[PDB]
Write a protein that binds this ligand. Structure first.
Ligand SMILES: *C(=N)C1(NC(=O)[C@@H]2C[C@@H](S(=O)(=O)c3ccc(N4CCN(CC)CC4)cc3Cl)CN2C(=O)C2(C(F)(F)F)CC2)CC1
Length: 219
């Protein structure tokens, strides 16, 4: 039986909200966010991991990531698996540009053995994973201006679609004033939403495609 409310921030499993700038690195922030959660759960250390390492080093046909042109959280995990590691943000900081890969194994801060994909559209499966596994990478339709107007409450825009376009991180869930929500960490800095987070409608027919393309890594 699952808890009614989850917030991984309260368990010390979520790092500071990052600022992607004008580089299309949402996917990279989503992926490192999920892996940060696992790293904390396994090792006890919370460390921001290198989104830039993903941007610079997985921009090739093998993965189909495009650096600042966008990419996939699953393929980010595959890169980390193939590479045998990823650096921390502190040693490989975010530049918001496509740069030549300069991964240094001496600076490895995390690994990935495999990743898990949840069933398409299944908000119950996402609830279970968030409750029991940790933060989960997801795709959403974040293309409507209302998304950037959000400040409080639960985002529930009838114009949202299942055609996703941005990777974000689900770090919890609950019910706010009778409305089920997913607690979502973005990568637009503190000024976005509620201190960088948005609560998005949950159990409302897979609203904004939030449970369409969910994945998480294993250390
Ligand atoms: C973030 N700053 C930006 N968005 C992206 O990088 C997104 C993240 C993901 S996604 O969440 O939008 C997405 C889209 C489609 C899938 N598919 C559908 C087709 N299936 C096979 C039939 C496989 C899964 C999964 C996900 Cl996670 C991809 N993003 C992109 O922008 C694209 C690309 F990666 F190619 F760059 C355009 C897809 C950059 C705004």
């Amino acid at each position: 039986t699952l808890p009614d409310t989850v917030d991984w921030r309260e368990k010390g499993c979520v790092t500071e909200v990052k600022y992607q700038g004008s580089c299309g690195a949402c996917w990279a922030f989503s992926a490192v966010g999920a892996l940060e959660g696992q790293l904390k759960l396994k090792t006890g250390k919370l460390i921001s991991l290198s989104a830039q390492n993903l941007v610079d080093c997985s921009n090739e046909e093998k993965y189909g990531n495009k650096g600042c042109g966008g990419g996939y959280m699953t393929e980010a995990f595959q890169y980390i698996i193939d590479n045998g590691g990823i650096e921390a943000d502190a040693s490989y900081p975010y530049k918001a540009m496509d740069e030549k890969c300069h991964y240094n194994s001496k600076n490895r801060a995390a690994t990935c053995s495999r990743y898990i994909q949840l069933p398409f559209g299944d908000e119950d499966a996402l609830k279970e994973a968030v409750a029991t596994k940790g933060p989960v990478s997801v795709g959403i339709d974040a293309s409507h201006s209302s998304f950037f107007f959000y400040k409080s409450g639960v985002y529930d825009d009838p114009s949202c679609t299942g055609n996703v376009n941005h990777g974000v991180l689900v770090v919890g869930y609950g019910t706010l004033d009778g409305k089920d929500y997913w607690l979502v960490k973005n990568s637009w800095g503190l000024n976005f939403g509620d201190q960088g987070y948005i609560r998005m409608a949950r159990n409302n027919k897979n609203h904004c495609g939030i449970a369409s393309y969910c994945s998480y890594p294993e250390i």
